[PDB]
Design a protein around this ligand. Sequence first.
Ligand SMILES: [Zn+2]
Ligand SMILES: [Zn+2]
Lengths: 172, 179
Amino acid sequence: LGPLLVLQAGFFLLTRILTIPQSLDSWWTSLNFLGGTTVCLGSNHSPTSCPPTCPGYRWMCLRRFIIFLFILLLCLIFLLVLLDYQGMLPVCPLIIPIPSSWAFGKFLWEWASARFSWLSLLVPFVQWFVGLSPTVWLSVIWMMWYWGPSLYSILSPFLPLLPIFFCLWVYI
Amino acid sequence: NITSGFLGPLLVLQAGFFLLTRILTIPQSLDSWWTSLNFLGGTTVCLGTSNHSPTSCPPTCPGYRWMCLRRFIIFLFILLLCLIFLLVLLDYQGMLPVCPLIIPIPSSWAFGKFLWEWASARFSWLSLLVPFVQWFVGLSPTVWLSVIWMMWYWGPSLYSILSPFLPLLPIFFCLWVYI
Ligand SMILES: [Zn+2]
Ligand SMILES: [Zn+2]
């Protein structure tokens, strides 16, 4: 009795995972428009779910595949985070006792700061911003969500004059 | 002296401008490419005129917010991809010291070796599928190409039995009961 239920649950969860790409590419295709789907060029079916006869269906499958690939990658990265959180990646820090946790992250950041040498200047600013934002981060996300495209639109006309006087500054 | 002295830094300025303007549009190119994948390789129109493509919304159009979002999202992925690439490069030089599971550090692909060894350790059944894959390589390459092409031909036929798929767990479950 138990094993039948276990197998049914496993199959249903596998179906959920396999249909995730449907939902995800449908969401992204919604992003293309003002939050609303469309109709595949050629019964007017959305290009996120075409019938097998529809030519776009072939494309859809390819699309479903790529999304799925990214998902796995994300999952992998997510997995790769947890191990790094738990300190199961015994990465030797640049010259020694091991970093109990986040060894990979600390090593990677140390290497980047040591080599690129401008992230050294960037890090103080980012640390300032994050530390000063226990809750300000939430508000600036809201501002970015609303004003961010707007401020980008206002800065963009002066976006190309920006390199000109940046060059002037570099000359001086 | 003065001529070349000025041109040098200014040459760097011009080259930087050109490279940044060529490489900062890649989010737009990839967004347009995916939107093309959505409709058999075509642009279509936005919801808002001149019928501009939805990946090049003017600021007046309401989609410029929307577009930016996905453009930004695409931009993020690029960094991630780049990061992967960067990692995929560093491991080759062995610049990632990862101690192997129980000792000298691996000369190259240390991170890849540790990850694969740990993953194989965690799942015993996974390795069971490894040999057949090699056999797939070990089989006739032409046979593998024919199989893949038939699957492409059988993809629509693959899901032509998609409706019977749902009962698959029950009947197999029934087998598990009778097993
Ligand atoms: Zn279609
Ligand atoms: Zn638009």
